Amino acid sequence: TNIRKSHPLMKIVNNAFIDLPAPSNISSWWNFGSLLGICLILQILTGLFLAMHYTSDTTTAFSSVTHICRDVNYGWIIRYMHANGASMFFICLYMHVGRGLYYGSYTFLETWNIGVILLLTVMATAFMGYVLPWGQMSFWGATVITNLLSAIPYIGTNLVEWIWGGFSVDKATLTRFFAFHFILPFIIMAIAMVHLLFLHETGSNNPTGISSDVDKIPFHPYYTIKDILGALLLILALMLLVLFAPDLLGDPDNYTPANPLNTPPHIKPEWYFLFAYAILRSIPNKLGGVLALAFSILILALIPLLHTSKQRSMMFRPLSQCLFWALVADLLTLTWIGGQPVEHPYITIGQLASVLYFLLILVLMPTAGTIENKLLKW
Amino acid sequence: IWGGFSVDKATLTRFFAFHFILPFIIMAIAMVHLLFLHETGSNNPTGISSDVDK
Amino acid sequence: TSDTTTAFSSVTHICRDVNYGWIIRYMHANGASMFFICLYMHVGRGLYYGSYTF
Amino acid sequence: GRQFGHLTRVRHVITYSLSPFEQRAFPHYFSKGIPNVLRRTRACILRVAPPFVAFYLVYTWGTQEFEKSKRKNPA
Amino acid sequence: RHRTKKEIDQEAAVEVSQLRDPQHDLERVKKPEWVILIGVCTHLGCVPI
Amino acid sequence: SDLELHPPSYPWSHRGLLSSLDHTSIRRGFQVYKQVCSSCHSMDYVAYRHLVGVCYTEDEAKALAEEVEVQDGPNEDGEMFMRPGKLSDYFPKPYPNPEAARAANNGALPPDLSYIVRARHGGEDYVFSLLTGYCEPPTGVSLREGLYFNPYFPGQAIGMAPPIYNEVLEFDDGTPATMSQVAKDVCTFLRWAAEPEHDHRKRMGLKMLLMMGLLLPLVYAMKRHKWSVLKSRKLAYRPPK
Amino acid sequence: SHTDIKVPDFSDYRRPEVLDSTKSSKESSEARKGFSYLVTATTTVGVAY
Amino acid sequence: ELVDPLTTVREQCEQLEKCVKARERLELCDERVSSRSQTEEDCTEELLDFLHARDHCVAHKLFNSLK
Amino acid sequence: APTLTARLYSLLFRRTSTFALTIVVGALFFERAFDQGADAIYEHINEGKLWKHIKHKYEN
Ligand code: HEC
Ligand code: HEC
Ligand code: HEC
Ligand code: HEC
Ligand SMILES: C/C=C(C)/C=C/C=C/[C@H](OC)[C@@H](C)[C@@H](OC)[C@@H](C)CCc1oc2c(O)c(OC)cc(OC)c2c(=O)c1C
């Protein structure tokens, strides 16, 4: 009788991290789950040590962040670890979603649906975080994204002013955004546990999409060691960015203090918002543009209802493989357009890419699955 | 823990941060408190086992 | 706001200017004391009834 | 809630394993490793690459077209 | 906004019917050389250049 | 007028991956700031003590601080006096307001120079190209000549008069104060002004790369060693009859 | 008929000091564990730093 | 008296083959603009084209002289 | 039995406490030898340049 197996706390650890039956089988694309956890605690830890010196008043917010970067012993690594960890958080998110899409992991309805909430929550958290240093991108970021609510008919204006604290972005806006940005990662952490709880009910999917109970291996030592290696690659990727190119993924305009009278000429999102940004502005309509933005991420919840194929994974589905990569490349296209001004070639090709995004998921990928069924006499 | 030779600017900003997080840490420890409790169930006024009358 | 220049001013800004900031502030203040009344009752109950054997 | 000894039913399958201390971590690492990656690449290139060249062409054309459009000539 | 003669020429002439929000220029000003506007875009609240 | 030109790649001594700032060039560049730019440009986020590690000594920087008059907080009668000023003082502000900044420089606001390398695309290359590349208008366009011509500025019409030329003050070591070198040194200083961590992050970077060059193959071997048992396993299927 | 089961050849995967079936493994036992534990010992030292 | 190395480098850059063609089409723009009645047609485009080729070459060379 | 990984294992690795002791003693002497080396490489690749090499110009 084992202490590891029967102690009411260690029970939980053992049935999640040690004795948990896992496929013999799962590739590097399965490393991103633990990497998201590492990202979560990295952002929690640095974010805590930034909160120790940050002040959330408009007069002083920019000054406190630069006080961190110049005066605070090693405040610069903490600040840019945080900044680049947020981008690392997004690289891992996108890899993790794409893995799920490819391998048919969305057939775990609860795990997947909680995952969609986790994406939206981490997006809202990181929007808030960018508002905090009170640069130019902070202010107009806060302006535009809060104003998305103003598209809700009849009550949208009241709602925007309700979260602002008044008629404009102001003193009241920044102090609550610090408070909202502090708590939300812990709420995320709690939802990450429920995500894992629903997952353990089935165990993991694998590259083949075929049930792997015939060949399970213990999580320890195999996926404990594969996870350590994967994390050490995540540390490389992060520490390359903070130590050799700290500002590569950010905006120079956020190094000028916020200014309510001038929006900059060049303004774009943070790289990881660029596809959704490109989708919304491809529509010359207020209500439709924001409805498309909401639909661009909420679509993931329809993907299980649109699975036509008699196989789970895309591994043995070449038509679907092609159309998956068309989806990735189209998403890469949309982040390129997001980066460009609203002028001649870019308006049309961004409109066509927007249409293709929705056509691929809604129509073209379900039809590919039926054709593939018919070709196998299924 | 002060941030220097005296209580100062540095002391108050971190005390806000420490005071924000610690109730959530408390909340997590309150769950572990309940988890250990459910293992036995409650005691009662008599101190005698009450399985005979749950 | 957690700066020394402004911390007292923000708390009184809550109590005078913030719509119903006064109930929130003093609910918080007296809830902390309520938290302690309940703690002491809860410990004493445990001491009396031998609940510490858990 | 799944445990070893309760997963599924398997009959008539023998597994031979060796100790980690009996065997090499990198058994024939380049001699067999390189032939494999090339084989894996060949297997997937036609599925992965053609959307990204299709991105590349629309990128190259789009940047070029935008550049040319903000020049004049006879006016 | 101080307006030149070429500027007022374009605004009076262009179609009221073909706008998304149908107004004449003359019912958008009081005296036609001075336009006073809140510099907040009606989309999502940026400052127009 | 909407048409743009982007800066070329100048081979800064700190452009390379594992490469120090030139602290001899940071020194000469502070000298450019104190004498030319500080008449117009704020640097609110750099203090005199920041120089003590970097280019100057403790004594050098204390004597440099003891050159300006700074307002100090109240005497025990209740009035605002002036003092020589210490290493703790941030670099002195021209103009009490942004509005007093706009009034002296003919409508135009000169922004802070504490951030300016990190706050403009191209970095020091842009600031070098905007400085060293001051030029004459082409035919077709004229300025309302409170504003001047620079090609590197967006829209081509800049409020800044071309503030650098041959021999605007001397360098303390003995260095020829050509406009090219006056621009080189100030941009080398403004990089340090934007990013004082620069040399420390590149030191830790080399340590990071060398450590990772040990740890990545070692953890790989650790993971392979454990995965050995599975990767070399042999299956046989032996059904009855 | 279970006596038909031979364990298949593992020479392809074996450490060099353990290819001779005619010779004891006990002799190379201290060395082989030595090499593998030195790897984890150095890693711990590396991570510790 | 006072020798700026940028003067030595800019002259040396302008004599290189790309710059000769781009100075040419700027000069051909220079004659075109004083000629017409009230032309709006700028030599912004042809100046910046020439500076593009010149400053590219300036950057490759200039810092080898400066201390 | 002459071989060195063997004597490394026999004296230091066999027991987990000795294994841990050899790691912590190992980490002390690594931190010195690596920081010695990595600084000396960084200083040599930036030959003058840093205030450590400028130092002697401004006096005692
Ligand atoms: C008075 C003439 C000066 C002097 C002596 C210097 N500056 Fe500055 N500066 C001045 C103005 C009026 C402006 C605003 C320009 C405008 O927006 O119309 C500037 C601005 C700059 C900038 C920012 C340009 C940009 O937007 O990209 C920089 C980078 C700059 N100034 C640098 C600079 C340097 C290095 C100086 C010393 C050689 C210098 N300035 C002095 C007015 C003036
Ligand atoms: C919108 C989809 C989605 C998002 C976003 C998502 N998850 Fe998942 N996650 C899943 C699915 C589906 C699986 C099951 C994968 C499988 O078994 O193939 C899963 C598996 C995982 C795993 C374990 C197995 C693995 O894939 O590595 C972890 C850990 C994980 N999720 C944590 C997270 C964390 C932390 C976040 C960020 C807060 C997150 N996930 C975001 C849907 C997602
Ligand atoms: C304990 C509080 C805390 C937590 C937890 C937190 N952060 Fe932050 N975050 C901050 C503060 C304070 C700043 C302002 C300092 C700064 O700009 O770097 C900030 C800054 C940011 C920024 C702006 C970076 C920049 O400087 O450009 C982003 C983006 C960000 N956070 C995202 C995240 C994400 C994602 C998480 C994890 C879900 C997270 N943060 C966790 C407090 C927190
Ligand atoms: C130092 C002792 C102690 C402290 C302080 C304490 N607990 Fe308990 N708690 C106990 C014990 C012992 C029991 C079991 C009582 C029994 O069954 O008679 C218990 C029971 C409870 C119960 C359920 C039964 C009951 O007594 O109502 C809850 C709920 C509770 N604890 C939550 C909390 C919370 C929340 C806190 C404040 C964070 C807390 N406790 C503080 C020792 C304590
Ligand atoms: C209290 C109320 C809260 C927290 C409301 C939160 C709403 C959060 C959203 O959903 C989670 C949101 C973050 C998400 O939309 C789906 C993003 C992908 C939106 C992407 C986004 O970014 C921009 C941005 O970053 C900018 O600044 C540099 C400026 C911008 O305009 C020019 C935008 C912008 O136009 C869009 C669409």
Ligand SMILES: COC1=C(OC)C(=O)C(C/C=C(\C)CCC=C(C)C)=C(C)C1=O
């Ligand atoms: C069955 O699949 C599983 C994996 O195999 C790919 C994992 O690697 C991990 C490891 C995840 C970690 C360390 C993140 C923990 C998150 C929080 C918020 C504490 C889990 C839980 C899992 O269930």
